[PDB]
Symmetry: D2
């Protein structure tokens, strides 16, 4: 038994009635409990994420099966059996917070590893490639996919306009308009790092690395029709499914694999290994098992933990570094940037975002300083040996630069169509029918010029792909 | 033909490629366009409304059919034929932005009238009563209805716990669990002021008033099955319908009616006429036609106009005043309070929120001061005859207080069950079946003790109502 | 010995050099330590207080000498010897954060008591009366005093315009333009509650109360010339003095006294006992000793504790209530209102602001939620006996209301001039000379019509007062 | 004659009295005017600048005397006689708003040129060099200078600890501790761009450039004693002086000169020409006159225009580019970053910040959207020829990179002491005495080890400089 109180810790005598002029009269300004309670209620909401607003979170554990010290000095990967706590958020992409989980979209797959050398965030998606290869385009791509800024409804004519004029999107669309565009839920879903990263070992040797998460529950997708049937009855079915699995002890898991590639393979390839519109062949760069992540604990409060969770591809740990991927390079900025706005300058003190490893630096102040700071010395260098100092054992590598000028220029060997064709041809007949069906439903109402350009991009990927789509849409492409 | 520019007005030479060390190298910090563009993208989102987050807006005109000058000095209602521009937002209540418009909920019906004596907001709902009668309870009610703070899913066990222990909710629930709980769209929908207000005429005489909006399009509601079928195909059908009707010239309209009641009628009624859980009998207080509102223009930008729209029940004009309704009283505070948070201190300068009537006062500064202020004199009284002065012609009335003391005390004559029973008995047999069906599907999984308490509250409203609900739920209530 | 780290807990390898293209080239975007460190730096500052921006804080202890249980049920005053921790901030009023502490102004004297029944804030000044008696005028008065909104310099012509047209200010100015307008430092300074409050005992009996703090260090004031001489070498002398006293173990202290007055004395007086322009005679309502406050500890971090400290007159505890003073009534609203803006919705979780008493309520979320919330139940009423409930033993009193209407109307018996005259006559000859000198230097450059109105207000207080000021200003008032 | 109104445009009947229970009773919640007026007052303040918080602004005109088209394509410099509007803000550095203008500090000299190709900000100081050469150190330097985080008083022992351990500061301190460390006012003051920039002409040819502003009023400084005498009577004398000059028609002016240096001169200088701790010889790189800036208009509102002014070194225009200077490189980021926090995401729409040149882009939304956006197309590429497109005539240059790796490494040829010695020897005997006097007063209380290190740095600049300082401080330097 407990008293209801104000935020001043005064017990509340009456949580039912406002203070008024007799039992029916107007209300008095001197009602601190009323005003305090309504003023806080009036301030509950913070801005949603600019993308991936709809999502759900869980905690778990990552365990190393095969130590990776030959290839990376990352502490959390250094010994067989080594266990690291994680927090994970899954998400959709485009629509706002309360939107259905049955819509077509990539799904977010964001893993925060609380390591002994700091927090490591691997901010992935289910699908292993992306629509674009330069961050400068991301607001455009997003604006095109987001609800129309006049009508508040998503319009295929808008995002197809952008995508068709951005033919590097052709590989991604070939995956997204398979039925994997609507995963059955967050458990029965692939995960991918997408980008090439650099792994650096204790000798300073570097490899390119790709990450892949393979669901213990298998991959399962929804057709458009199966999605509609779910949507009719539940607009948060994946959020429900994840919570429910974990509450009943049926913990979902994923095995982590990597691919590794020498830096010197750049010239051996007909695409850029750091173009995030490209996968690497599993035949040429085989998947190597690392370990397993199991999610086994729901959050205690959705807002405090899942809503306020902050992930960044720039939360890298010794041994793991960015590649030159221009898309990744902009993400390194944009995540902490948006989080300072969304969550406050001190968002890194919110519990879910706090490292397990110690934090000591000379940053200070900012909105909502809750950490009881102390001491006179908030600058370095200083004369005091006991104050925090830089540690040269933790310097990052020094990547070689091949360019001799500061330029704005597309990568060489963009190769926009070849992998899309390879993917298309890798589909079963049943999967090819689904892809054509889904693309046809999306493209049938768009501007004719845009519709033709889409067909041409897919035709350049594979002639059969393009021809089938043309026939399904009633578009005669004989004169080309 | 136009240049893309930065926010500094410098034309952009390349909107495709980040600035990099050669064609494929890492990105440079000196890329003002990349950073400016991403940093603004990163800051697009503001907090959604704490309730009524999902909604849609339109502009139009209100035209007076019958002058109301016998009863109110309100300027916009003074003359036959007098036209006042309006902005209107419609909304659901509980779920976030992006949520479906096929869910059970009251619907918001918020009208801003841009009058010659200032902006007048009538911030209504479709349904004419409310669940509670004191604002101190509003955060509780909302929290009970909102998705569970652990699971992020709405849970009937939670809101039925609250409602059943708040039996003044019984009349509201008797309307909301009719099929009017799911309006077909925003056009084919009732509107209501809900509260009693005070109308004050040129002689200073006051009457109680209620407001009603009657759709020219008639009322159409969705059964739970029809709502499911629409939810499957379109999560935003009401937003779509409203835009589309207006774009095709099929402008929706509502007639405005009032009921009027003498102050003195308090003492003779068996309920409090300022209890917003009560309606007034249309036999005893007949609807009187005032005018018609037609919505004929979509906004140019959904975020700037509909998202940023701010309404408050405290935006009253001369001739129209609050009543003593303890629910209304809290609303006077909470709306501009929340809006200062949600939108900024200067939210009243956002174009949709601006009055047509001139604004002159000694307020200053605050975030995002865009108005080019000038002058030395920002205080009153002052010696300058040309500076803004108070104007005694515009004083509000001086309501009589019946209370002796500052108290926290429930109103007399709460009468929580009688009108709910009257409503129930007014339903056709088909409508009583729908009610019971919709209640049954909501209650069937709730805690048994809460379930029984719901049944008892409805049984107190009407025996046949309560017994049918009990029969439908398999609950034997004969021992009580 | 400690590593410098990022906020992710990654040790920093180099805290000297940015990451660049070779040793002399431009900087890279992928420098997380640079960006994180600059971005936090860029966000250190929050808005200063709207008034009393310049100030200094200290902790200490309040110890009861004479229990007050006969007059108030306040827990912290219930027993001889009972000790309550305090946090105190002292301040100037008008100028910004870095402004000199040698300027004429009231001084703030804000005491937060961490009691067993919640935090109690007594938000006083040194001077025992105020310029104005209604909170509607506060923004006006402030705007007049503040630096001119064009020039950013304070202008006597502006605030004298306001003050002269607000003659209830005449008592306050008669104190403020004595040399007590510039206290020597914060230790050698009086403290006052200013307002009448209500004390309520365990029988529900109410008295009016005034609070007074008497410095153990005695009162010392600066002449204008002494203030200039300090200002020449130190613009933060009072902040220095306070820190330095406490660091040397020379702890300043104040004894707390109250005056007590029956509610029924209203009719015995020629002023309103709740008019904050008025003092109560010490002959007729003698000072009664309560206890002593000693300040004995400097804060650990000036931003986290002193800058982010939030006090509100509405932080009242059982046994202590507001009076009907219209000036106080507005303050009840304005402090927590400004603090939500200045500090965040969750400002009451900031350590200095936290109560020692337990906090349990159904409030939730808001920016920077750091408190690890949990549980499914965030609403009341609820069916769970272990969740927080209202406690009727802690209801506030029910003050009698004498008015029968909602009005906007000045108090009866404003009596604007009598106490100013009494104060003037109470001054020693030396003190009267300083008053006239100080007023003369302030008035000599103002508008002649305003100047004359000031002289007339002071003449109405006391003929000699007014005549001396007139002579000193070269104004001939023969003919009035 | 004008009515006082609410923000809703309703005329105010009484701007004196709150609404209350009779003439002396407590206040009612239904007082929209009171709560609106107090709530806006409660939100007047925004965060001050993190540095340069104290300052003053004015408008004027820049007129070209010698067209610079041989060296830069900058539009505003292209023709003799061409006039460009400016806004200028002058400032101190370390102390807050409200601090005196008689303190030692660099002075800010920030110039916004409203050019036909966009806004160009030259964000200078009076002194032509800086304490540090890498932006990574800036928060450390600032934190050491700023008031101690515990005491709120600036402590020489703190900043001398930093500066001594940062010996690249030696040249700066040699200027700052001359009497030019306290300019007499803002008009009688030098201006400097500080950094090397790059100028690029219409043929694509690049030169290094430095900017210098020479006051038509001459340079005049204050001794410590002359500063104290002013500080005694006016803590805003420079703000006053500026306003008063312009109001009286006595417009202050500065001639703009540049120094120009071939890129290839790097290799034969004994310093790095992009090290902002270094000046360029005026014998070897003579000052070349460009034009004249006259300040002739005070702002209409200090908050809206001077407080909310936003400058950034990254507001460059075609023809003017950053150099590789590692200090400048971080400024390019930090200014718009802090401004998004300080002012809002849409700070560039605040009138003083708006370009004269057209702004057209696909950015949208964000807090306080006041610009009436319209249109369906917010993404590029798109199919619409009339939507904003990139324009390749406005690409920036492609600087050659000399580095072959991503490194964190100090520049070659730091040469920390040579120019400090040259400056010392360039002082008159009178100026050397002032320098030693000013340094001695600053150093006399600092830690002995730090004090010695300071003496040693200045001794390395010039043996006489160091010996005199040692003698003045009573430090025996023999055993070194
Ligand atoms: C004490 C009772 C209530 C409280 C405390 C309350 C509070 C709120 C709050 C804080 C908002 C968000 C406003 C914004 O950010 O702009 C809101 C929106 C709204 N409320 Fe209420 N509300 C109450 C009762 C009601 C009632 C009785 C109705 C109808 C009679 C209603 C209809 C609405 C509507 C339509 C909106 C959305 C306004 C818009 O379109 O922007 N509310 N309410
Ligand atoms: C890395 C080094 C530096 C950093 C990180 C830095 C950062 C900042 C920041 C964050 C502000 C606040 C600006 C605002 O809120 O609008 C500022 C203001 C200012 N800085 Fe710097 N700064 C640096 C070096 C310099 C240099 C070298 C100069 C002169 C060359 C300078 C001149 C100014 C001026 C004049 C202002 C005030 C502009 C105004 O009037 O608002 N700063 N700086
Ligand atoms: O993220 C996407 C992209 C394309 C279509 C779609 O429905 C969603
Ligand atoms: O707003 C409401 C109230 C009750 C049930 C419901 O589904 C929605
Ligand atoms: O607070 C005040 C009031 C009047 C004069 C002054 O200098 C300060
Ligand atoms: O900016 C500065 C630097 C050094 C001493 C000082 O008083 C101010
Ligand atoms: Cl921000
Ligand atoms: Cl740091
Ligand atoms: Cl006002
Ligand atoms: Cl706020
Ligand atoms: Cl609560
Ligand atoms: Cl853009
Ligand atoms: Na191993
Ligand atoms: Na020329």
């Amino acid at each position: 038994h407990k008293n209801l109180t104000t935020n001043q810790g005064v017990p509340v005598g009456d949580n039912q009635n406002s203070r008024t002029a007799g039992h029916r009269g107007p209300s008095f300004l001197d009602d601190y409990h009323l005003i305090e309670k309504l003023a806080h209620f009036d301030r509950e909401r913070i801005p949603e994420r600019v993308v991936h607003a709809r999502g759900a979170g869980a905690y778990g554990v990552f365990e190393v099966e095969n130590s990776m010290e030959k290839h990376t000095r990352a502490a959390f990967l250094s010994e067989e059996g080594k266990q690291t706590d994680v927090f994970v958020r899954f998400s959709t992409v485009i629509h706002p917070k309360g939107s259905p989980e049955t819509l077509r979209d990539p799904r977010g797959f964001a893993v925060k590893f609380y390591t002994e050398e700091g927090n490591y965030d691997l901010v992935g998606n289910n699908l292993p490639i992306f629509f674009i290869r330069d961050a400068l385009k991301f607001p455009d791509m997003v604006h095109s996919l987001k609800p129309d800024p006049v009508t508040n409804i998503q319009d295929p004519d808008r995002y197809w306009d952008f995508m068709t004029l951005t033919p590097e999107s052709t590989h991604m669309l070939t995956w997204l308009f398979s039925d994997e565009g609507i995963p059955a839920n967050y458990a029965e879903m692939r995960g991918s790092g997408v980008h090439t990263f650099r792994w650096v070992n204790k000798y300073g040797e570097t490899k390119y690395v790709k990450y892949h998460w393979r669901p213990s529950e298998g991959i399962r997708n929804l057709s458009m029709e199966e999605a509609a049937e779910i949507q009719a009855n539940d607009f948060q079915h994946a959020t429900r499914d994840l919570y429910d699995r974990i509450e009943k002890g049926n913990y979902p898991a994923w095995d982590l694999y990597v691919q590794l590639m020498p830096l010197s393979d750049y010239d051996e390839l007909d695409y850029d290994p750091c173009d995030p519109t490209k996968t690497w062949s599993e035949e040429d760069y085989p998947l190597q098992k690392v370990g397993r992540m199991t999610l086994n604990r729901n959050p205690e409060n959705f807002f405090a933990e899942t809503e306020q969770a902050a992930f960044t591809p720039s939360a890298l740990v010794p041994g793991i570094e960015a590649s030159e991927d221009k898309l990744l390079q902009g993400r390194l900025f944009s995540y902490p940037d948006t989080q300072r706005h969304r969550l406050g300058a001190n968002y890194m003190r919110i519990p879910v975002n706090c490292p397990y490893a110690p934090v000591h630096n000379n940053q200070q102040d900012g909105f909502m300083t809750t950490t009881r700071p102390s001491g006179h010395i908030n600058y370095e260098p200083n004369r005091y040996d006991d104050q925090p100092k830089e540690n040269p054992h933790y310097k990052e590598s020094e990547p070689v630069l091949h360019g001799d000028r500061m330029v704005r220029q597309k990568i060489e060997k963009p190769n926009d169509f070849k992998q899309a064709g390879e993917k298309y041809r890798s589909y079963s007949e049943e999967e090819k029918q689904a892809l054509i069906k889904n693309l046809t439903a999306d493209l049938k109402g768009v501007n004719e010029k845009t519709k033709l350009l889409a067909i041409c991009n897919f035709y350049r990927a594979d002639e059969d792909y393009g021809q089938r789509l043309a026939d399904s849409l009633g578009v005669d492409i004989r004169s080309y």
